Amino acid sequence: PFFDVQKRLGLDLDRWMTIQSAEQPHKIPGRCHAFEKEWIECAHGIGGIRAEKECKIEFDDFVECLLRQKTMKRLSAIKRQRDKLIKEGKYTPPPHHLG
Amino acid sequence: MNIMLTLLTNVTLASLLVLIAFWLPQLNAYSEKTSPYECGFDPMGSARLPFSMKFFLVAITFLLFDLEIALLLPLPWASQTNNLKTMLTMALFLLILLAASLAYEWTQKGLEWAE
Amino acid sequence: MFMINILSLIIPILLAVAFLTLVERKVLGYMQLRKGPNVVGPYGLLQPIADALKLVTKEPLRPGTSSISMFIIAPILGLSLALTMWVPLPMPYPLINMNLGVLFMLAMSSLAVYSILWSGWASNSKYALIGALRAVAQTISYEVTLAIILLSVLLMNGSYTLSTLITTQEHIWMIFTSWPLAMMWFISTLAETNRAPFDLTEGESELVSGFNVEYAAGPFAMFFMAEYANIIMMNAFTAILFLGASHDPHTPELYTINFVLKTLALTITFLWIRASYPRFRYDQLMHLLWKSFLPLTLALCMWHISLPIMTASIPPQS
Amino acid sequence: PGIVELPTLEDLKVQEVKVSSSVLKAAAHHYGAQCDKPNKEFMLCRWEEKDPRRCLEEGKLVNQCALDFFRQIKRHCAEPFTEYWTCIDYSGLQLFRHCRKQQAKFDECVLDKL
Amino acid sequence: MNPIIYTTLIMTVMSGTMLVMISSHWLLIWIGFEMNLLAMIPVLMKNFNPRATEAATKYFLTQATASMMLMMAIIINLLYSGQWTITKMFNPVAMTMMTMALAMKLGLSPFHFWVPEVTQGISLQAGLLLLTWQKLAPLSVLCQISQSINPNLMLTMAMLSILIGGWGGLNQTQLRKIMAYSSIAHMGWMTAVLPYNTTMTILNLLIYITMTLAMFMLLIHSSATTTLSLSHTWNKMPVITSLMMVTLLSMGGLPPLSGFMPKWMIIQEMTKNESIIMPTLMAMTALLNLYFYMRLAYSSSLTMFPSTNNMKMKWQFEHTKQMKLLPTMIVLSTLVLPMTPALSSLN
Amino acid sequence: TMYIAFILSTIFVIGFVGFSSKPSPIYGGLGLIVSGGVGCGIVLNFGGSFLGLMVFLIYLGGMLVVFGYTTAMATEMYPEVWVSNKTVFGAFVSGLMMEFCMVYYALKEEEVEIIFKFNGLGDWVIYDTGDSGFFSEEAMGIAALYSYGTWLVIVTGWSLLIGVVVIMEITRGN
Amino acid sequence: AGRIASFLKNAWAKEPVLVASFAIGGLAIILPSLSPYTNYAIRINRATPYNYPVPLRDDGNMPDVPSHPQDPQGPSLEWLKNL
Amino acid sequence: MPLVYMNIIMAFAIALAGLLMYRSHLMSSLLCLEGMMLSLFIMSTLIILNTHFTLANMMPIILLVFAACEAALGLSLLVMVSNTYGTDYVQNLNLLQC
Amino acid sequence: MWFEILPGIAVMAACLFIPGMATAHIHKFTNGGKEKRVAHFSYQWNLMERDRCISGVNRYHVTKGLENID
Ligand SMILES: CCCCCCCCCCCCCCCCCC(=O)OC[C@H](COP(=O)([O-])OCC[N+](C)(C)C)OC(=O)CCCCCCCCCCCCCCCCC
Ligand SMILES: CCCCCCCCCCCCCCCCCC(=O)OC[C@H](COP(=O)(O)OCCN)OC(=O)CCCCCCCCCCCCCCCCC
């Protein structure tokens, strides 16, 4: 905040909704709870400038968890390469994959 | 999905009832038959009759009340918290603010259908 | 088989509407020292059929100044909403079992206000639009009390699931716990279906027939079917909400008989109001809603939030 | 980067507990009473390790404990248990409150015989 | 309006601004902007003439469009980071969206068109509020996210603001439009140094708010909204016009007055970053603002325009109300240059 | 049945093109409520039952409804129609074709880079695998408004009361 | 004395709806803070086991954690059974 | 990102373009504003449900109520303009050029 | 007199009874003679999905007891 009234008065006005690894109702976990926790525990108290380079791996893992972009690419490659071999009559998917 | 089938059936049967209703009768239409009904004479178009700020004000006040109602709908699950005193304080707070909006509209003319 | 379920829900409801026309005419007649339909069939039992047949063979005059797209969309929306309002109703077991059934009904009935906003606008005539605007304002204003009353009553239910109402009312009716909200809810339901002293949009002696002047024969018939389906549905909702019937899982026919009888009683009361009172003025019903019903409804919502907490009588959410 | 290491298919084989949800629910209270050791031990492993692959043998012991629990039900009053879980199976919410008479004679079995 | 209702609406405007400045959460910052706009719209329409209604409508349209763009930027940022904390933006296009939204709220040059019209269309009190208090929230957000702004976009908008404020104000005979174009130029000066030193932005904002408060209170004291109406003020209260002249000279950044401090500090801080061409351009361009300030000073205090016969009536009357803190605002806007090293208190 | 969220989203964008080409405001409102209905369906397919029903009850039956009501009062002598302008047709057609081109490109390429990178590998693919237990996570998160969201309730209620006061200030007309 | 009684008289005679609504709202405001049962409602909400009660490892010196669900340790719902 | 997000962001872009490219009626622009809000609501809801950010489930409610308050304010402004000029045409809102 | 209104009321009563009875009997027919299982929450859905898998006939309502394994 521009004027950190919350940290001076000890009040929690909006910090409780600020991250998904904060305390949740019924302890329901965030989908990327561990990834966010690891990135936050890496980046804590070293400033944003340092945290941008020195916590790049944790933030990359977090971003992959949030938007599974590289996971989607790998799944798309497996799918489209499977079809690339159905046409030629090369690959037969096994019984547990067809029913 | 069962609900989608149900909606499809309802809409389809309503439209089929339209089609029978709006195509089956035998028709014979002339100009004076389909003339707009005005109790035996012709209507005046005039210029944008649906006016008066009161019709718009009731719509706006309904909109704001409906927004507060949207804020009140999660209440049945809100009573299932261990922190019941905070939840009760906030629910009653929202309802006092609803009552205050009603009272302020009431006292400052507001809800009145004036001259 | 589920399609058969949908059909065996829809078709009997339309038949019940058709014979509700006859029942309403006979109740009004006998309250007025006359008989009503007793010539066309035995005790007028073929009269709804005569009306339906005459209407679909009558020339449906469409206005020359009518946007026909919405002119035909409005009856489709009205009838589709009127029919789909029954799919979550817990005659013992619902057709569609949702967590938020009553929320679904609130939303669907709030979408039904478009059928008047579109019919009045489409009919042009520059005057039926004013009646349509009055009807829309009345409808949206009473939606407020419907929503808040439903909210306050359901704080004993614990959820928006309609099947849970049967469990909530196992030992006692919800009327004995919320009768003031029951009276306000019943009058709000009266006002929402444009019935009784609240029939301002179709005042027979105020604006002839209001938003339904230009509609004739077939589309008029479907609008009528939508309104009467909404009447029976609202009375069924009232019976399930306030007069919960005992349920035997091995004999659901008993619950169905109970529910049907109570729904018919409430519908007969709806027709009973029609024969007993003069008509509210538009500003008079708006004053009633905004200055009489709304403050008490807010106070009772407050009371019904406080009550389960201060008595350790909060229901389960499952 | 790196290979996600996976258990083989035969590292994952177990004698299944092949009874339905109503059968499982009918015995659930006595199941919790009698099978707490391996169940709590496996749940401890699962929350401590945050890894399905690290707790497979504990889950395999969970399965065996459930299996022997059910074989103990079978040999003394399989019949009252069968009636109780049938009555539980009828209702669409599998409610306990509609089956107290059958739960009664299931419960006064396991006391006297087990 | 009811005095209680007007006080409540003013307090709600300030509380929306404070919500913007005290929140760590983007949703609450957006809430503060929403609350500020909601309470601000009626104070624009306080007099209620078609000019006031049009000013309020244009203000509402620009501010609501900016608010929706800001929410979209927040949602894109959350989509890529899952973060609600106001900090560096983790997405570049979200950052661009947010920068454009905040500039439109401020009224920077490519989004400046609303400022002159709205300022002209509202009263002098409404304009005083519009050109002083409404700059705080977007500038505070910008100072919070300054480490992730695109310097090229921000500097482009600031330079355009200076140029357009200089050129647009050259053509004005209306005092409210002159104030609006001066405000555009000063916003450009504020936002040019924002990528480099937010303390300089805060300093320039404080100095500008002091000068604008002094000038608007002098205008309200004079009841003048056109340059010719102000040209009658010498024949009624020449002290007001002389004070206005020294204030206008301060606005032009003439040493040794207080208005020279922000320009001098910003030029120094920019040259510290190998920025020499842009400060030279900015200082040279500000001569336009100084030109139409000097035109106003010529018409108001340094020369005496023809008066009217009906002015003798006004001589026998005093002001019913007195502008609060106006002497302090005048002294602060002109005489504070020897106190410059105190700027480090803003660190 | 395999793709449901994609038809819903394409129809959503089509309705957006329809009402944002700006025919007479009654048809724009019709397009907006069609878009709102299909979007409520979209979030219903994602497990957001309460949120979608909120869309319905408050947006389509509230805010819209009020919008169409107010259009029915402040309109043209002959309230306009879609066809009356070639500009409406041009805008709608350009929007529809830019929808079709980009959905075809994304479907057959799965690596479009219009501002953002996109991959139409599916929409079910991103769903996570787990049990939510005996409650709706959405309802628990929203019911936390009264326990966790005290500040949010305070500011929203104040803004709504201020909204009533503000509307009554502006519309008085003096 | 007579002033407030007369005001209540006039309100009851001319606006009974507002009198009833304000009394009901006031009781809804006031009564929960005096109820012995509000704490009971809090306790009932606390005793509802939505989540799994994931166990702990007894490192020794855990004499108050049960071991078994039917050990004389850990909270008891006997109070709820009779309420 | 999945293609639903693509279409939702596309809807926001179309609503933004429709609002920025004006026509005669003010109500059409207000409807474009409403479309922008609706697309924001759906995008927020999808992001919040997908990542199971449970406490952020309430954020779409707040967005909806605040944007509807702004819509009420804009409707009142339109009504005042129409009472001035008999229409909501934006070309009548040009007397501040001088 | 008034009891001649009863025929129309009886027709209405039959028409209103048909939906509930039909729903109950269809639910019994398509769910193995038992009530249609209710899954308001993901735990109940998972119960039914487990029930379908172990039935061997891809029907959740075919209940395997202690006769299946033990
Ligand atoms: C410990 C307990 C704590 C809680 C206590 C709770 C409160 C108990 C006392 C309150 C009693 C009143 C409750 C609300 C009643 C209505 C409020 C109201 O404004 O009334 C006066 C209002 C207005 O009356 P008015 O016009 O005379 O007064 C207006 C205001 N003054 C006095 C200033 C002029 O009247 C109506 O609402 C009339 C309704 C018209 C329709 C009539 C229908 C008749 C048939 C009804 C049949 C039964 C219905 C239910 C059926 C079953 C449903 C399941
Ligand atoms: C070097 C930088 C500053 C340069 C400017 C210094 C002050 C200039 C003042 C105006 C000069 C131009 C006008 C000259 C013509 C004569 C003055 C005029 O315009 O009006 C005269 C009039 C006299 O009023 P009078 O008749 O006395 O009223 C009696 C009661 N009825 O009214 C007056 O006399 C009003 C005079 C107002 C004076 C205002 C002073 C404001 C603060 C000045 C700060 C100076 C800073 C110097 C450098 C500091 C560096 C840190």
From TrEMBL, chain A:
<keyword id="KW-0999">Mitochondrion inner membrane</keyword>
<dbReference type="Pfam" id="PF10200">
    <property type="entry name" value="Ndufs5"/>
</dbReference>
<dbReference type="GO" id="GO:0005743">
    <property type="term" value="C:mitochondrial inner membrane"/>
</dbReference>
<dbReference type="GO" id="GO:0032981">
    <property type="term" value="P:mitochondrial respiratory chain complex I assembly"/>
</dbReference>
<keyword id="KW-0813">Transport</keyword>
<feature type="region of interest" description="Disordered">
    <location>
        <begin position="84"/>
        <end position="99"/>
    </location>
</feature>
<keyword id="KW-0249">Electron transport</keyword>
<dbReference type="GO" id="GO:0005758">
    <property type="term" value="C:mitochondrial intermembrane space"/>
</dbReference>
<keyword id="KW-0472">Membrane</keyword>
<keyword id="KW-0679">Respiratory chain</keyword>
<feature type="disulfide bond">
    <location>
        <begin position="32"/>
        <end position="65"/>
    </location>
</feature>
<dbReference type="InterPro" id="IPR019342">
    <property type="entry name" value="NADH_UbQ_OxRdtase_FeS-su5"/>
</dbReference>
UniProtKB/TrEMBL annotation, chain C:
<feature type="transmembrane region" description="Helical">
    <location>
        <begin position="100"/>
        <end position="120"/>
    </location>
</feature>
<dbReference type="GO" id="GO:0009060">
    <property type="term" value="P:aerobic respiration"/>
</dbReference>
<feature type="modified residue" description="N-formylmethionine">
    <location>
        <position position="1"/>
    </location>
</feature>
<dbReference type="Pfam" id="PF00146">
    <property type="entry name" value="NADHdh"/>
</dbReference>
<keyword id="KW-0813">Transport</keyword>
<keyword id="KW-0830">Ubiquinone</keyword>
<keyword id="KW-0679">Respiratory chain</keyword>
<dbReference type="GO" id="GO:0008137">
    <property type="term" value="F:NADH dehydrogenase (ubiquinone) activity"/>
</dbReference>
<keyword id="KW-1278">Translocase</keyword>
<dbReference type="InterPro" id="IPR018086">
    <property type="entry name" value="NADH_UbQ_OxRdtase_su1_CS"/>
</dbReference>
<feature type="transmembrane region" description="Helical">
    <location>
        <begin position="293"/>
        <end position="314"/>
    </location>
</feature>
<comment type="similarity">
    <text>Belongs to the complex I subunit 1 family.</text>
</comment>
From TrEMBL, chain G:
<dbReference type="GO" id="GO:0045271">
    <property type="term" value="C:respiratory chain complex I"/>
</dbReference>
<comment type="similarity">
    <text>Belongs to the complex I NDUFA3 subunit family.</text>
</comment>
<keyword id="KW-0496">Mitochondrion</keyword>
<dbReference type="InterPro" id="IPR026626">
    <property type="entry name" value="NDUFA3"/>
</dbReference>
<keyword id="KW-0813">Transport</keyword>
<keyword id="KW-0999">Mitochondrion inner membrane</keyword>
<feature type="region of interest" description="Disordered">
    <location>
        <begin position="55"/>
        <end position="83"/>
    </location>
</feature>
<keyword id="KW-0812">Transmembrane</keyword>
<keyword id="KW-0249">Electron transport</keyword>
<protein>
    <recommendedName>
        <fullName>NADH dehydrogenase [ubiquinone] 1 alpha subcomplex subunit 3</fullName>
    </recommendedName>
</protein>
<comment type="function">
    <text>Accessory subunit of the mitochondrial membrane respiratory chain NADH dehydrogenase (Complex I), that is believed not to be involved in catalysis. Complex I functions in the transfer of electrons from NADH to the respiratory chain. The immediate electron acceptor for the enzyme is believed to be ubiquinone.</text>
</comment>
<comment type="subunit">
    <text>Complex I is composed of 45 different subunits.</text>
</comment>
UniProtKB/TrEMBL annotation, chain I:
<comment type="function">
    <text>Accessory subunit of the mitochondrial membrane respiratory chain NADH dehydrogenase (Complex I), that is believed not to be involved in catalysis. Complex I functions in the transfer of electrons from NADH to the respiratory chain. The immediate electron acceptor for the enzyme is believed to be ubiquinone.</text>
</comment>
<comment type="subunit">
    <text>Complex I is composed of 45 different subunits.</text>
</comment>
<feature type="transmembrane region" description="Helical">
    <location>
        <begin position="1"/>
        <end position="18"/>
    </location>
</feature>
<comment type="similarity">
    <text>Belongs to the complex I NDUFA1 subunit family.</text>
</comment>
<protein>
    <recommendedName>
        <fullName>NADH dehydrogenase [ubiquinone] 1 alpha subcomplex subunit 1</fullName>
    </recommendedName>
</protein>
